[PDB]
């Protein structure tokens, strides 16, 4: 396709997997399973599902930090994800488990009539931005809705897994994570006077 | 006037009230009362006064967060206000009351009494939140950053209904939008592991 | 040195000490001692050493805040330094003492070698004292994730102003750079922060 007689339109597509040795890379397998890979060994599985895996209200961050059996990169990703959630106030909605250096975090999206002021929308907005390549299919509506985002699934599960080429629906990318880095603690609530 | 023989000087004045549905809008009513408005519905009233409304030294934010019952935009504004207070160390200076979902926050400016004190930090954040004309409330008005002080004893932030209070200065999002960037820049550590 | 037969190369070295009344200024004295001066009066001394001074696992920040006997500028510097640490997750690694308005902070670097708390503390030390912190580190460059020193303790103590700067000139660059990274690398320790 030549423009003004002499200018051919040519396309260029970046192989983004080569950025694996410096930064995380996030992709979508299908609407229920999404992934964020940190190198060629490990990563986190972001699963939207109706089946709960954590059935307790304990999360125990301090014990996990003291033991220090976890991967530091993965915990940094978890911290960025949580601190990017706008207006998080219902702490019972979140639970987690770190026994033996594992990472397993569960957000209860069924904790929620208008369905626009809920914590589930903060969780789903941050999930959408974290897996920005292909998260849009997992939501009820692809666009035209930010404050009132919803999905039919009841739980979001962020759990550590092994590396494997899951990137079927969208190609891997760091853009969601790198965008979320600048927004940490930007729209969170105070919880104590002195902080 | 007319410049270079062909250029007439003309002016604009932006109708900033039309930004109401997207962002807060702050203005000054008189010396003591200032306001920030959220929607055409609600907002916070910032009153500098000598009369307290909270006589206790408790502020349990976590219990309010558990129950919800509050307008999330207003509590976001409160969090943006408090987090941007530079060098806040006297926790007893601030009290609050969220019973029934309302918002009431009281900063005791007389607790810390000349320069480089807690009251000055609270007034620095107040002047930025209500930058549209809050300079009248502060004593000097200008030439003072670390020594800002006002004759009033308490700063009281209370949720209110919408009303055209913007007599002294026009409504503006500029103060709030400025405070968003400079959010956690001057918080002291109170813990080894935050 | 004349370039093009037209232009003479001329140099320019800025005296940063005139920024003393507006911002901190950091410099290096020798391998072990580094300094950050505030005003013509006060400052902090950052000493890498094999000898501890605190010898307890307490750091009563909350009590120091109520007593309010300390220098606010120095405690702001300490707050920026601590919150700039990448992945501080060992609360026992740090101790301090604020008796009577004093400031005496200690980081135990013995907890080690790549990707540990001591490396993060040494990274933040490198940025805070950027004017000559490289001499203390085992490798001057070519290393970020495995920075290590032979010293077990980094000790930050409030001191008096004096012409400490021998190895590098005073400079605000480390502090001003750390102000932007002040909170962007923090672990969550609690669900509702």
């Amino acid at each position: 396709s030549l423009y003004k007689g002499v200018y051919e339109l040519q396309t260029l597509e970046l192989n983004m997997e080569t950025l694996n040795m410096t930064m995380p890379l996030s992709c979508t397998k299908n609407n229920s399973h999404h992934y964020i890979m940190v190198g060629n060994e490990t990563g986190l599985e972001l699963t939207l599902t109706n089946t709960s895996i954590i059935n307790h209200k304990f999360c125990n961050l301090s014990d996990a930090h003291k033991k220090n059996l976890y991967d530091h990169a993965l915990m940094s990703i978890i911290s960025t994800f949580h601190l990017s959630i706008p207006n998080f106030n219902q702490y019972e909605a979140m639970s987690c488990d770190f026994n033996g250096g594992k990472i397993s975090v569960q957000y209860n999206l069924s904790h929620s009539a208008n369905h626009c002021g809920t914590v589930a929308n903060g969780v789903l907005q941050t999930f959408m931005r974290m897996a920005w390549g292909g998260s849009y299919i997992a939501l009820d509506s692809g666009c035209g809705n930010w404050d009132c985002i919803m999905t039919s699934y009841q739980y979001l599960i962020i759990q550590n897994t092994t590396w494997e080429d899951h990137c079927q629906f969208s190609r891997p990318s760091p853009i969601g994570y790198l965008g979320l880095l600048s927004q940490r603690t930007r729209d969170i609530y105070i919880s104590r006077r002195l902080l | 006037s007319l410049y270079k023989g062909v250029y007439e000087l003309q002016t604009l004045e932006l109708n900033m009230e039309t930004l109401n549905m997207t962002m807060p809008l702050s203005c000054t009513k008189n010396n003591s009362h200032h306001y920030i408005m959220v929607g055409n519905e609600t907002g916070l009233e910032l009153t500098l006064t000598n009369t307290s409304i909270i006589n206790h030294k408790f502020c349990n934010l976590s219990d309010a967060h558990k129950k919800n019952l509050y307008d999330h935009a207003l509590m976001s504004i409160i969090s943006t206000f408090h987090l941007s207070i530079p060098n806040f160390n006297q926790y007893e200076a601030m009290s609050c009351d969220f019973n029934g979902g309302k918002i009431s926050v009281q900063y005791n400016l007389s607790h810390s009494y000349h320069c480089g004190t807690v009251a000055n930090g609270v007034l620095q954040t107040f002047m930025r939140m209500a930058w549209g004309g809050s300079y009248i409330a502060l004593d000097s008005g200008c030439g003072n950053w670390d020594c800002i002080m006002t004759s009033y004893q308490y700063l009281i932030i209370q949720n209110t209904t919408w009303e055209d209070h913007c007599q002294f200065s026009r409504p503006s999002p500029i103060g709030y939008l400025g405070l968003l960037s400079q959010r956690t820049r001057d918080i002291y550590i109170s813990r080894r592991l935050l | 040195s004349l370039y093009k037969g037209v232009y003479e190369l001329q140099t320019l070295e800025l005296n940063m000490e005139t920024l003393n009344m507006t911002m901190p200024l950091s410099c290096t004295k020798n391998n072990s001692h580094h300094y950050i001066m505030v005003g013509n009066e006060t400052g902090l001394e950052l000493t890498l050493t094999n000898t501890s001074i605190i010898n307890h696992k307490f750091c009563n920040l909350s009590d120091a805040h109520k007593k309010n006997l300390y220098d606010h500028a120095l405690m702001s510097i300490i707050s920026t330094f601590h919150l700039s640490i990448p992945n501080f997750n060992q609360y026992e690694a740090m101790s301090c003492d604020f008796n009577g308005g004093k400031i005496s902070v200690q980081y135990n670097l013995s907890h080690s070698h790549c990707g540990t708390v001591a490396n993060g503390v040494l990274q933040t030390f490198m940025r805070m004292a950027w004017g000559g912190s490289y001499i203390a580190l085992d490798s001057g460059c070519g290393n970020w994730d495995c920075i290590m020193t032979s010293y077990q303790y980094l000790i930050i103590q409030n001191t008096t102003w004096e012409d400490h700067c021998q190895f590098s000139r005073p400079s605000p660059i480390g502090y001003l750079g750390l102000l932007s990274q002040r909170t962007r690398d923090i672990y969550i320790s609690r669900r509702l922060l």
Partner: antibody, heavy 124, light 109 residues
Framework: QGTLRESGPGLVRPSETLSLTCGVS?????????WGWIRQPPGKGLEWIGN???????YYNPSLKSRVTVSIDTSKNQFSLKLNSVTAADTAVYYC?????????????????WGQGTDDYSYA | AGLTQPASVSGSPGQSITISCTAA?????????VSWYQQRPDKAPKLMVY???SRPSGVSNRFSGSKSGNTASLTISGLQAEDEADYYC??????????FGTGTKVTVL
């Protein structure tokens, strides 16, 4: 659940020091609860003496602030009151108490070591 | 100084009775988390109400508290003869100090 039990001298003379020990069985004093002494003179209303916390911090009545000490011994699982310069007005029944209060001073101090606590503070 | 409280309240079986507990207007900050205790004769006080109407397990729903302004109160709905006891209100003063009332002698007629 558990019990609290006073033990000490049932008789002191004027100007000597009363010393009462409260033993706690079935509850751990190292749990986040405030251990206190209340007083009932024989026929009058209740008067709160004081309390101590596992951090060692103590809080006292303003009237009874110069004469009283309250100590905690977690190793034997007990706490105790020491009231010096006793007088006739100090004749009374002394009660132990487990209190679910939240003092901000002890809250902010234990955040790193003991982590996030509960929110079921009865304040009673 | 101590919280003002009625010296005696009384009623017949089955009716509701109210025991008030009033603080001075100069000590409103000392009037918080008003909790109510029953002391039977020659027994230790037992907590009946804490916060506002929250009660320990085993305490019936007949005991219910309220708080407004400078005053609080305990309502015993459906009074019975076993409710005769000395009722004490106490507030948690913001200097971390429990302040008791003077005690109410409930009489059942």
């Amino acid at each position: 659940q558990g019990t609290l039990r006073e033990s000490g001298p049932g008789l002191v003379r004027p100007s000597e020091t009363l010393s009462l020990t409260c033993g706690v069985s079935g509850y751990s004093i190292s749990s986040g609860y405030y251990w206190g002494w209340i007083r009932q003179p024989p026929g009058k209303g209740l008067e709160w003496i004081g309390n101590i916390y596992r951090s060692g911090s103590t809080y006292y009545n303003p009237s009874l602030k110069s004469r009283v000490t309250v100590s905690i011994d977690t190793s034997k699982n007990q706490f105790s009151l020491k009231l010096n310069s006793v007088t006739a007005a100090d004749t009374a029944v002394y009660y132990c108490a487990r209190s679910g209060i939240k003092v901000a001073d002890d809250y902010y101090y234990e955040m790193d070591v003991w982590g996030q606590g509960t929110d079921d503070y009865s304040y009673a | 100084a101590g919280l003002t409280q009625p010296a005696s309240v009384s009623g017949s079986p089955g009716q509701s009775i109210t025991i008030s507990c009033t603080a001075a207007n100069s000590d409103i900050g000392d009037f918080n988390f008003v909790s109510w205790y029953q002391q039977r004769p020659d027994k230790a006080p037992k907590l009946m109400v804490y916060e506002v109407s929250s009660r320990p397990s085993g305490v019936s729903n007949r005991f219910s508290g309220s708080k407004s302004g400078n005053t609080a109160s305990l309502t015993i709905s459906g009074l019975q003869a076993e409710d005769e006891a000395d009722y004490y209100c106490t507030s948690y003063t913001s200097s971390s100090t429990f302040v008791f009332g003077t005690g109410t002698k409930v009489t059942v007629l």
